[PDB]
Amino acid sequence: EMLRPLYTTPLDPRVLDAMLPYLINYYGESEAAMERARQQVASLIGADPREIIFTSGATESNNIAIKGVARFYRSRKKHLITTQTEHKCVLDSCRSLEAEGFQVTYLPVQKSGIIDLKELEAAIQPDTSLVSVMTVNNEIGVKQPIAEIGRICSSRKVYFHTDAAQAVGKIPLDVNDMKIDLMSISGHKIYGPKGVGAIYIRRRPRTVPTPLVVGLGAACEVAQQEMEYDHKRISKLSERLIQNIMKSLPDVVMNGDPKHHYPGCINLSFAYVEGESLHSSIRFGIGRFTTEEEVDYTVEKCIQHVKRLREMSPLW
Amino acid sequence: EMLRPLYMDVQATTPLDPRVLDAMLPYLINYYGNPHSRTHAYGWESEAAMERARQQVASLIGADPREIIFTSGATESNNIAIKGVARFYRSRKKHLITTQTEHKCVLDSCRSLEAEGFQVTYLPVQKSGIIDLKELEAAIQPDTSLVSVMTVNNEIGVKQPIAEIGRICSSRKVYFHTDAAQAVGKIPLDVNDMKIDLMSISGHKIYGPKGVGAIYIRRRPRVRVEALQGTVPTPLVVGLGAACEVAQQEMEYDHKRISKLSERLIQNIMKSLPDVVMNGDPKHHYPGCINLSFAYVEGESLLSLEPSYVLRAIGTDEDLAHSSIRFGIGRFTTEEEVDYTVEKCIQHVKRLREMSPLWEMVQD
Amino acid sequence: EERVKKIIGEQLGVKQEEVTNNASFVEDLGADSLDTVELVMALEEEFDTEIPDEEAEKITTVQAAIDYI
Amino acid sequence: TIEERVKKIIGEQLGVKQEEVTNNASFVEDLGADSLDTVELVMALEEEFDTEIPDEEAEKITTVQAAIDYINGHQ
Amino acid sequence: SSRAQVLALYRAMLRESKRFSAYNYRTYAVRRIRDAFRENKNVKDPVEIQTLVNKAKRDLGVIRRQVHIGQLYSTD
Amino acid sequence: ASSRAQVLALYRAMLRESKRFSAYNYRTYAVRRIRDAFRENKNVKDPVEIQTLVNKAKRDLGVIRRQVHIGQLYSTD
Ligand SMILES: *P(=O)(O)OCC(C)(C)[C@@H](O)C(=O)NCCC(=O)NCCSC(=O)CCCCCCCCCCC
Ligand SMILES: *P(=O)(O)OCC(C)(C)[C@@H](O)C(=O)NCCC(=O)NCCSC(=O)CCCCCCCCCCC
Numbered sequence A: 001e002m003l004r005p006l007y008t009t010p011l012d013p014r015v016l017d018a019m020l021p022y023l024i025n026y027y028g029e030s031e032a033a034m035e036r037a038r039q040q041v042a043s044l045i046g047a048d049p050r051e052i053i054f055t056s057g058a059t060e061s062n063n064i065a066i067k068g069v070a071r072f073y074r075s076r077k078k079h080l081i082t083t084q085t086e087h088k089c090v091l092d093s094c095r096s097l098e099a100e101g102f103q104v105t106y107l108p109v110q111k112s113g114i115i116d117l118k119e120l121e122a123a124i125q126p127d128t129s130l131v132s133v134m135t136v137n138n139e140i141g142v143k144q145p146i147a148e149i150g151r152i153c154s155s156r157k158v159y160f161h162t163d164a165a166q167a168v169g170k171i172p173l174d175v176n177d178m179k180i181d182l183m184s185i186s187g188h189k190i191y192g193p194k195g196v197g198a199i200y201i202r203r204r205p206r207t208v209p210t211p212l213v214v215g216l217g218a219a220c221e222v223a224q225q226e227m228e229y230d231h232k233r234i235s236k237l238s239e240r241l242i243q244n245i246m247k248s249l250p251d252v253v254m255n256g257d258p259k260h261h262y263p264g265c266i267n268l269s270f271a272y273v274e275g276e277s278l279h280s281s282i283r284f285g286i287g288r289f290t291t292e293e294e295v296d297y298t299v300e301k302c303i304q305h306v307k308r309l310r311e312m313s314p315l316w
Numbered sequence B: 001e002m003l004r005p006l007y008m009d010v011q012a013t014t015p016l017d018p019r020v021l022d023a024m025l026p027y028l029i030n031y032y033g034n035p036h037s038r039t040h041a042y043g044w045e046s047e048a049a050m051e052r053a054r055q056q057v058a059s060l061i062g063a064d065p066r067e068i069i070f071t072s073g074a075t076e077s078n079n080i081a082i083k084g085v086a087r088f089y090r091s092r093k094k095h096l097i098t099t100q101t102e103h104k105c106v107l108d109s110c111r112s113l114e115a116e117g118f119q120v121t122y123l124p125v126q127k128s129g130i131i132d133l134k135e136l137e138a139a140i141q142p143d144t145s146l147v148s149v150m151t152v153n154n155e156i157g158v159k160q161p162i163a164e165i166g167r168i169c170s171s172r173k174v175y176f177h178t179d180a181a182q183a184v185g186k187i188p189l190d191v192n193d194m195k196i197d198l199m200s201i202s203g204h205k206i207y208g209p210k211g212v213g214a215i216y217i218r219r220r221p222r223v224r225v226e227a228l229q230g231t232v233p234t235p236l237v238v239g240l241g242a243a244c245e246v247a248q249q250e251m252e253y254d255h256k257r258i259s260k261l262s263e264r265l266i267q268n269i270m271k272s273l274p275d276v277v278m279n280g281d282p283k284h285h286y287p288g289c290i291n292l293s294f295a296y297v298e299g300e301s302l303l304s305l306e307p308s309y310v311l312r313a314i315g316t317d318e319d320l321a322h323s324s325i326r327f328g329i330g331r332f333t334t335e336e337e338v339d340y341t342v343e344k345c346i347q348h349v350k351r352l353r354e355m356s357p358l359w360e361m362v363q364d
Numbered sequence C: 001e002e003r004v005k006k007i008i009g010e011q012l013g014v015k016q017e018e019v020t021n022n023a024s025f026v027e028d029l030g031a032d033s034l035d036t037v038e039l040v041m042a043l044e045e046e047f048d049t050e051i052p053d054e055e056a057e058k059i060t061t062v063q064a065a066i067d068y069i
Numbered sequence D: 001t002i003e004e005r006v007k008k009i010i011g012e013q014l015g016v017k018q019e020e021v022t023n024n025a026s027f028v029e030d031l032g033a034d035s036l037d038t039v040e041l042v043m044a045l046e047e048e049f050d051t052e053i054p055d056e057e058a059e060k061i062t063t064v065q066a067a068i069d070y071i072n073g074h075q
Numbered sequence E: 001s002s003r004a005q006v007l008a009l010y011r012a013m014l015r016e017s018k019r020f021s022a023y024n025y026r027t028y029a030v031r032r033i034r035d036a037f038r039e040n041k042n043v044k045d046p047v048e049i050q051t052l053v054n055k056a057k058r059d060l061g062v063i064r065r066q067v068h069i070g071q072l073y074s075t076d
Numbered sequence F: 001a002s003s004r005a006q007v008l009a010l011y012r013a014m015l016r017e018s019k020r021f022s023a024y025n026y027r028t029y030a031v032r033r034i035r036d037a038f039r040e041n042k043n044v045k046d047p048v049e050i051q052t053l054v055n056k057a058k059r060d061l062g063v064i065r066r067q068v069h070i071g072q073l074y075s076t077d
Helices: A011-023 A031-045 A059-073 A088-100 A117-121 A148-155 A210-248 A292-310 B018-031 B040-062 B074-088 B103-118 B134-139 B162-171 B234-270 B310-312 B318-322 B335-354 C002-011 C035-044 C055-056 D001-014 D033-047 D055-059 D066-072 E001-019 E024-039 E046-073 F004-020 F022-042 F049-075
Strands: A053-054 A079-083 A103-107 A130-133 A157-161 A180-187 A199-202 A266-270 A279-286 B066-069 B094-099 B121-123 B144-148 B175-179 B198-202 B212-219 B277-278 B289-294 B324-326
Touching: A011 A180, A011 A210, A011 E046, A031 A053, A031 A180, A031 A199, A031 A210, A053 A059, A059 A079, A059 A088, A059 A130, A059 A199, A079 E046, A088 A103, A088 A199, A088 A279, A088 A292, A103 B103, A117 A148, A117 B121, A130 B040, A130 D066, A148 A157, A199 B094, A199 B234, A210 A266, A210 A292, A266 D066, B018 B040, B018 B234, B018 F004, B040 C055, B066 B074, B074 B103, B074 B198, B074 B212, B074 D033, B094 B103, B094 B318, B134 E046, B144 B162, B144 C002, B198 C002, B234 B289, B234 B335, B289 B310, B310 B318, B310 B324, B324 C002, C035 E001, D001 D066, D033 D066, D033 F004, D033 F022, D055 F004, E001 E024, E001 E046, E024 E046, E046 F049, F004 F022, F004 F049
Parallel strands: A079 A103, A079 A130, A130 A157, A157 A180, B094 B121, B094 B144, B144 B175, B175 B198
Antiparallel strands: A053 A199, A180 A199, A266 A279, B066 B212, B198 B212, B277 B289, B289 B324
């Protein structure tokens, strides 16, 4: 049993144990099971169970939300706002809407990975229908001001969607305090099974297989019970990796604005070298099951490869 | 994916059949969950499960379901049979007969009975691995209680005349036990056509789960045993029954295939490596277990310890029977495993015949 | 085209010399429904492309398999 | 005859060198351990060699002599 | 009693069997299905054909459960 | 409806069962999470919270048993 450097998520045994009886009965459905899963997903994000719809993943959730609001307002609201660093599915859906006659603005991100709230608040048009901003940047590991964006959108009577696929279970989310109207959730991001996702659709005035739905609900419940422990643990391991790299390489810098970092995603940039097979940057990931041995092995291999590639380029 | 030759593990020859595990899943789920999450039907579901398993095991060996008792394996079944019949009949039946090529557990139990005061005779085997029926028929005493001869030899892979032994034992009012652990589900067994009174069955030998076995105890006429100086978990019993049913439906196909692959392995090894001999009578050999001895390989073939006591009983020399290989072929064995095994065997035998073991032998 | 005819020759047991571009499967190649299903599945295994049952039913000659996308 | 191996395992799990290996020493009072480290200690003794210790006998192992006289008393 | 559905069952059983995470189970599955349909070729009793189709459907369910659950335990 | 020795027996059972995980990440995570859990919940006086933690510990013990044994039946080397 060897190790693997830190660059989906593993299936939490509590989740697989929760979905086993439903897997057995699925080859050869339950309203109660799907209702419990609905209550679990809702309870994680601070929503009501009636506001949760199960999809095949965060991709279908994004298309349902963005394409649903956009296609519903194809009469007098053909403008949408999103980020240029969104996931590939969100960008693809916005390009499809652009092909159907919608004007879409892709807001740039600053060198910190956070969106400019002044640029967003100044980009709203009278015919703007939906604002879709990801909850966290999965590449730099920075948090977007979701609560402030929600306040700006609710103050201007414009619907707010967010792709929380890389944020659910990793940072606290309250769908009311952040004034969120639509949210996308992916199962295999929170140690749940692949092929299942969810979407939050606000209902208050401010055919996915059953084992997969059960698995998503179980993953959300375990995440709710483990968010604090996982946050402390992953924070410690992240500081260990970053500090151990800084101790041996006095010229590496960490991309992204500090004080707005979620611990799971680290992004370190190296000076005179790039492309490390096991300027550009390298994104390390640390999760619930990451061990100290994986962190130390990753720091050792990373130091070795950086030192070698710097000793193979003629410079001074 | 990297292959493994057909001589590394004896358990590797009988992996857990996915149909068996599929039969065992619900009982595993309702088992390993502490008895506060179980439903108010676990007792019935477990009595019904164990009755179905009894019907499956019994139906494979041609017995009545009431005659099947579940144990932790063929070892406990052996102790129950020999020690049960011997200790229960300590009145007028103090003699037991067995073979010198039996499994280690049976021989150990017979040595225990010998230490507690029972007279046991270990019948020798001929150079073919088969016992002499005249020696068995001439060794029965008026106080002989049990004759225990395994159905298949786990080392050489030879079949004993189980039906004839049963006829001889029933002709002189002697109980007949057999260790069918390597035979159940692989060759046909009928506890009625064969005068069998007690039978041992192993779960993991018949592509079932580990830690479960069975014993057949005849009831018409009734055979009795004494308890030994506990309850096997239900998912394992379910697994044994499922393995027996699958074996009953797959025995002919598996025997045809295993015969083909066995003949391929032996022919390919003998074709490239001369001076090779096959232990056991080919005319009474089960193809799944092959045992080959190689000539000019001095010392030992490492892959200090004792040699083989089964090969010593078939009259094989110390050096010839010391370096021997037992190949195993099963339900899931592929042709690539056979060809890779014959290639690795050719390479290792060719290498070891030109060397001498004195170098590794002197490492102190 | 080399992969299609090569796979057909490999599964059906034909060398690279009897690889005729115009031979019927059931009448000129000695095959059955099972060999046909396994053949289509082998074609779906060589290149990462899937073929539905309706389009597979129309594949009764060699030229149908030779470049269909 | 096998007390040295027990003391070696206790020395390995509790983080004590081969100089403070005193016979007849309490785990919580003379070795700076607690109930959790004690449970892991009994599990280490039953984990090195393939022998099992029940909960009743494991609860009685609060000193070193208890562990030395329980692995020999159940052979 | 179904002509096209038997071929669809053969295709489905082969496709699902190819997804076995283990080599011995995958090879055994493809071989046993191939040899099984080939052996039961040219059967005329419709009762026997229906029985074989039922066994094939149950075995297809077994292959599905074991492939999916085994894949959920198959760490790569 | 629990005592001190029963809690220690529960700790021993969860550690023993967690050590039987066929995978490295699950085994290490289980042992680490159980150690940190009992150490963190050490010196709790409210009996309601203690009973809740013990019940959750028993449920998690059932999960560990099922997953360890079933995974062991699927763990091909
Ligand atoms: P083609 O010429 O159009 O079709 C071929 C023929 C005509 C022969 C065939 O399609 C047909 O119609 N024949 C009728 C008789 C027949 O074969 N009926 C189908 C019986 S199906 C069957 O035999 C089930 C076998 C399933 C065994 C599965 C074993 C593997 C289990 C693996 C477990 C891990
Ligand atoms: P020791 O100090 O001599 O005695 C033990 C003590 C006194 C510390 C303890 O028994 C005690 O009485 N302390 C008081 C507080 C208390 O009793 N707490 C109960 C502990 S129960 C608990 O918190 C366990 C939590 C559940 C762990 C779940 C782990 C899940 C892992 C899943 C892996 C997939």
